[PDB]
Amino acid sequence: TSDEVRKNLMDMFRDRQAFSEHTWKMLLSVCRSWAAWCKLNNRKWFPAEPEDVRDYLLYLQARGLAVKTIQQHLGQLNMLHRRSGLPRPSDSNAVSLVMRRIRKENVDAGERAKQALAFERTDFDQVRSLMENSDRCQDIRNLAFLGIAYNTLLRIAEIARIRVKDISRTDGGRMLIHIGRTKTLVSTAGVEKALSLGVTKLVERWISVSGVADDPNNYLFCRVRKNGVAAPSATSQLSTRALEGIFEATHRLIYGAKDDSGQRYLAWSGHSARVGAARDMARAGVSIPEIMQAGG
Amino acid sequence: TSDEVRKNLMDMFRDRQAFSEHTWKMLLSVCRSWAAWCKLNNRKWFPAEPEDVRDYLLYLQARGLAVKTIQQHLGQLNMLHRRSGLPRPSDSNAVSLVMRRIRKENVDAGERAKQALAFERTDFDQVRSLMENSDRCQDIRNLAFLGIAYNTLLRIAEIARIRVKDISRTDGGRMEKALSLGVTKLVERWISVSGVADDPNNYLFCRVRKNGVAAPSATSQLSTRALEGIFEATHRLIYGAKDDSGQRYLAWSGHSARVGAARDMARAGVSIPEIMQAGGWTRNLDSETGAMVRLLE
Amino acid sequence: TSDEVRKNLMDMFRDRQAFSEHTWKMLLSVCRSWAAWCKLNNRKWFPAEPEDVRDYLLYLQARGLAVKTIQQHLGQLNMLHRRSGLPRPSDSNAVSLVMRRIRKENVDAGERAKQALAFERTDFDQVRSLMENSDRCQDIRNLAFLGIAYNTLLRIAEIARIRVKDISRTDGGRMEKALSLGVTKLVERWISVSGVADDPNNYLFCRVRKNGVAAPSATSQLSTRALEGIFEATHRLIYGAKDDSGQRYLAWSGHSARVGAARDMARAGVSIPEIMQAGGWTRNLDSETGAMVRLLE
Amino acid sequence: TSDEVRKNLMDMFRDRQAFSEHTWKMLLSVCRSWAAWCKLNNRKWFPAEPEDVRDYLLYLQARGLAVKTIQQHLGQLNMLHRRSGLPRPSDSNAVSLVMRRIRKENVDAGERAKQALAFERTDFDQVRSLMENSDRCQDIRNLAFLGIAYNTLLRIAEIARIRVKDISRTDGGRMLIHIGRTKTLVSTAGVEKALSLGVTKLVERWISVSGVADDPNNYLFCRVRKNGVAAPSATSQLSTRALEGIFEATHRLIYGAKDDSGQRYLAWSGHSARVGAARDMARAGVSIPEIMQAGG
DNA sequence: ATAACTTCGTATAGCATATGCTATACGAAGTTA
DNA sequence: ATAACTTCGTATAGCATATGCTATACGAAGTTA
DNA sequence: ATAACTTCGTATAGCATATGCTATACGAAGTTA
DNA sequence: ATAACTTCGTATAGCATATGCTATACGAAGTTA
């Protein structure tokens, strides 16, 4: 019982590299949240008792949290126990049922899983047309980024990993980016994305002015300082938080400052180009497999 | 574990013909590597224990072995074991978790599946251009081989397996894969140049001694390796000595042909079955890059 | 089995809001039928035993119940049981084998899934043609309803749920499903004829007393049944008294509209999303019969 | 052990109607074959001992039987034990391995799973053109059959079940046949197959002359006697063996008598129209889903 | 008596589906004319 | 010696083959207006 | 001092996949103006 | 009485919702040419 369990955790934590860094992040997050509520309520946090998991979740639901997040909290616990030999809280009618009731309660009230505010072709062009005539080094990059973004529909972390070495041009001129790792695909073959003749121009302008080509293993996107001086590196990639930042700025520039409220998706974000390109594609009546080919 | 495994192993040797020789060779090979490593690392190699294996695997990772290669090593282990009352290491948390991490870890390093240098048509014409007028027997044979290889997108083995009578001048007077015409023309020259036509049931291709003389047969199977050699040599003949380094596929390999065909094939005006139907399947470098580029411009 | 089930049942009643009322109603209903049958047949209805169940099922088969109906009966049983330490009868050889045979047996008898009489456009124009000039309040309401039902391929419920302000004269001056024009025209007449426009947040449709007077609300939900009635009556109004017999769908049902639309829709010049996008999905009777006919001629 | 096992067989045999009549047929066939070899070799036939299953199969392989048939014999046994609580012979390295060795041995020698001799459009038309001008009652049917055959690609047993009641015409005229049961699909909704304007003519000619319409539940295809008098029935359908017979005759008529050898598929059979129509469809570059729509 | 079946049994294909075996690459040693 | 190549071994890429039925294929024997 | 990040934590969407809940139909009794 | 309809119950057809991660979203706090 407690010898195998304790062992099963050592092996897992031992090979956490076999899990997404984020997975672990949320794990430790949920537990920290959970183990808190337990403390506050004087309850043994692990192994969680179903009844106790129920109140917890019901308590999350009352704090205003969104269904998906609750399913996460429930999800993390579920994995903490299963991957420990122990049985999961979802394996209890109390948890399994509270969860549905909850999900049904929120949805019935109108809760909905939002989607990033789209960045469609019009936005791109509108954006390009504007900053294209700018010599500002920070401007040449963002435009490059937003170009690859839209063009490739690549998630931002996938973009931030593009090695200068990964860049390759076709015989027709167009650039090509090779991608091995990606949220949904961990491959040594991966896929390559072709850039439109124009976006490649955009990308080329950035490289020159950035100096990212002084080294093949240099990250394609690097950071840029106030003095407009770039900073190629093959060890530190520009933070995805920053990329999401390119999207907020470009938006703020065209549409002004965010609402005062505080809601979400009131501006472009790391996924805008993906969802936007996607739409634009279907509205163009592109082949389904072609669409899937694009987003994967 | 004892007699049950004994008996299981005995069944395995009994119906050894249930697996290919290539499979058996890999099995023995992996056991050979797994065994040695175990001695070195003072561990029982049979039955193999999770932690022990796991360790073995992390060793190969460091060894620099591809993921594909590592998966084969566990695969063979799981085979030997499934084929005995004993379980399978792949059925353990540990062994299962290292594979997960090893797989991921290695895909963030810079591991990329190999390809096979495309032997394109341009390449072909160039070759043709030199061995063209050359009268050296083997030289000739080499041009014909590369001809069918490229004109048939047939894997080498098949290419080697081909015999005389199998070549039926069907339609147009050309030799069921059909040889273009300029290629039918090639195969012919050597055909006679080697005197294979004689005893049919021979093979399109054969051995070509250092004295420039053939040696048709119907008992000897031309090593695939040799075929791969033809490509290689042909490459070093046009691009000089190998590139060295460590990389793999810096010259042409047996399939460079198939790849080459599909390539220039799709490059021009062709559907997708052509790229499949020919070889026998189940290119981004070109310009057919996709929708988003189309849409954009 | 004892307190564990007790507690399990207690959880079920605790978070009863995890299942729909419709689901609960079916559960209770099946238990009610299963229970009675058991008393009659002197068997413990809980926990339910395979052979016992099996017997129960073969009873329903004979009862003449559709397969779909029988699957629901086991489904409810498996639910009640899964939701208790006790297993599930569906997880038994017997219960599993009878379903297999019952399913097959019944498909060789002559069991055919029902449809829902298509309420086609021709049908619609005909209706329009009579209630057209009629000035009877309900008569009117009935024409408008059938209008949105057909002009929106919206399931009834939604149709019932609709309120006043929800109708936004968006584009062209027509009332986010958009009402054609001749239909926007319809909804309007009654809208006033009933005085619903007044307190918004009311409902497009409402009750129409036997004295021919409306009764707008924002507290009362117009029974779907009523809506289904509108169709029915409308049919008996044009095709006289029902056909009787035993068959199901000898008149129009709530969805007859959706069906009708898709039909005449695909019948003319329309893609397939139109047949899907409108209603909200995931016709051979027409002429789009297929390839082999195309090929043949 | 022997009480549950014996019980498990009673329940199964009790609900055999939940299994294809043929499944059972082959079952009893295989066992009869097997239990024989056992007797002949003085071995307990059930529960089969792996070693004994190996020789049996090896013995089948030597008698010239085709891989697929062996996998059947092995398959039936496998089900007899599994559905009896007992473990299957394939669950033994000796059986599992002999099976592969065998399959590899036969295939390596060139064994191949044949396909029915095709009955393509040309054959149909060639066939139609000929018997179309015939008043012979047996001729009017066969042509009807071969028409539905090709048109619908329906397996023969599926054809032999077409109720006169199942027949329905479109508003454009074309006939339509409704099918609920079918090898791969047991549905109360099933599918309907539209007939080409011409094949429906063919079908109509048959009905009149057959009198199959005197009753809705009368089988569309009935038998015809020497005096050319049909025999509608709603209880006895024409044997599939007979339908396969239509295919041999029509062939013999156009191409003469079978080879003297004795091989298989030297003439048309119950599946010729299916495989043939199929080909004709693809060679016409018809959409894949359309093709699948056709054969299902 | 005979066309046209039907029943019957042994042989073998057809259709969904869960799931590791087999082939090619390439340096390199061994083998022959 | 060494060309031209075979046999080996380890690395790594490419493509199937057990499940469990369900149904057709074909001859030979029995059935009936 | 400040632009432009980065690190960090809590909140919530995105992607494969295994798998029973929910809605509509329709005779029919109960309820109201 | 009875129109016009609601509430019920049983039959039967239509459409999702737990798995288990992996990744983005956004503010607030810390870092550095």
From Swiss-Prot, chains B, C:
- Where is each Tyr recombinase domain found? 112-295
- Lineage top rank: taxon: Viruses
Catalytic residues (positions): R155, H255, R258, W281
Instruction: Tell me a Gene Ontology molecular-function term this record carries.
Output: DNA binding
Q: What parts of the sequence cross the membrane? A: none
Q: Does the keyword DNA-binding apply?
A: yes
| InterPro entries in the record | CB (IPR044068), DNA_brk_join_enz (IPR011010), Integrase-like_cat_sf (IPR013762), Integrase_catalytic (IPR002104), Integrase_recombinase_N (IPR010998), Phage_Integrase-like_Recomb (IPR052925)
Annotated keywords: DNA integration, DNA recombination, DNA-binding
* GO BP, one annotated term: DNA recombination
Q: Where is the Core-binding (CB) domain?
A: 1-85
Q: Which family does it belong to?
A: Belongs to the 'phage' integrase family.
What does this chain do? Catalyzes site-specific recombination between two 34-base-pair LOXP sites. Its role is to maintain the phage genome as a monomeric unit-copy plasmid in the lysogenic state.
Its quaternary structure?
Answer: Homotetramer when bound to DNA.
Instruction: From the Swiss-Prot or TrEMBL record, give the protein name.
Output: Recombinase cre
What is the scientific name of the source organism? Escherichia phage P1 (Bacteriophage P1)
